[PDB]
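Batch 3, record 17
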Amino acid sequence: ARVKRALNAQKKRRTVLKASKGYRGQRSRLYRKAKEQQLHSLTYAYRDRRARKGEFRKLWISRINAAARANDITYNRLIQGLKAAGVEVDRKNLAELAVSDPAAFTALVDVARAALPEDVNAPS
Amino acid sequence: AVPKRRMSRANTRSRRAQWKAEAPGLVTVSVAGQQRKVPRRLLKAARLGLVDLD
Amino acid sequence: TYAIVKTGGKQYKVAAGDVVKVEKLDSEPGASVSLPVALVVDGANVTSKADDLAKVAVTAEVLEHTKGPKIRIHKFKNKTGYHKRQGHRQQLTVLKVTGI
Amino acid sequence: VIKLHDLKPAPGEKKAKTRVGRGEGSKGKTAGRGTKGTKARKNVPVM
Amino acid sequence: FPSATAKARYVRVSATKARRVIDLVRGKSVEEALDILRWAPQAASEPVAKVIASAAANAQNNEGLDPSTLVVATVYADEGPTAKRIRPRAQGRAFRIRKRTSHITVIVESRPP
RNA sequence: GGAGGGGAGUGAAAGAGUACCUGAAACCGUGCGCUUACAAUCCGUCAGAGCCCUCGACGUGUCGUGGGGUGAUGGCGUGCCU
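Prediction for the assembled complex:
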């Protein structure tokens, strides 16, 4: 039985070419170049899914730092005071409060300042 | 010297778009009554019946 | 008024009538569940003490169990010949918050 | 009643033939021979 | 809009050379396009003018449209079959020569003044 | 001028016209949408404004467990094989 290769190959070629819509130049037209770019794209996506959590945490920390310095307190002392006070709001919702409900953020800053020690540089 | 690399489509098209023709300007003229368009460079010749109008 | 509820290792800011995607819970659609709270913001005063947060809970109704976006994984290392294709679809539940 | 389509081999009777040089999934680009040398091309006599 | 079409196929000009001339008469009235092609100093203007005139005649005759209201709506040139020749060169090598043709499609349509 | 085409006919079909079954890809056009002329780009990926299209709900535009196209802008990122 002589077997022609067309159907089996066309299947995966169509899959790869469809996945490469929107690419520039050869990378969206030719199957080989599109396949190379697909390897790179999936590697990039895998790496970026891991890095995205850190990126968003960095953005939240930036916003919380801005809103805390607006209340005359630094981010690190505010985090220490919030941990001491036992409140368990994470940085995502802390930034959400900072942007959407400034009064709530000010109240949390007040409780964090209350929970802080009297001399932060003491050998405690 | 020989081309080291194959041109991308963008560069080829951007250079190729410069190979074009300009439209000659046309002015009206009355030959044997009927109005028709003619280049200004040939206005006098048309008025003298020296240019073939189809 | 709104609260910050904890479920599945994560926290979400929800108000009454909010619809939020959440990690899978072992509850049938149309049922109701109660969730712990990490902060309550009612009007102006903010509830932050642990005991007061323990005295309150947020009740929500399970709308459906859905699936996350399809994720395609293709691990690759050049000059090696190593490839590893893998897919994943996370399971999720959709909760509508009934009240706080 | 046993028909012609009820006949099956015994469990473990048949084993799939392994086809080498058919991509990096199973045994690719080398068919299990390693890199170059005498043994990567023909063979070595027993004696 | 009512319209009529005409096609010249296997015209023995390359598609790019025809496009150079076609790019002069797009969206223009049939009479002004015919004048432009009459005075264009390119060899490809004769086939294109013939296609446009044929389309205008089709519009006037078969659909009974007013010639004064005709406009060159759509016009393009495609590639036809290309024949392969050989030009002998220095030191015994032979090169390939391509004899390209083109198909020209024109669509005129009636538009209000 | 022909070539070729448009009507008209034949045909079940002319998206069967003696360049003729089916008619893929590379390659070449035309039209529409988004974008692009202060900008150093393995050309993707992750966030993402704006614009356009579409499915639901309530009014007249405004959200949603929405979906698609394009993407200014920011982060990361040294092609495949041997």
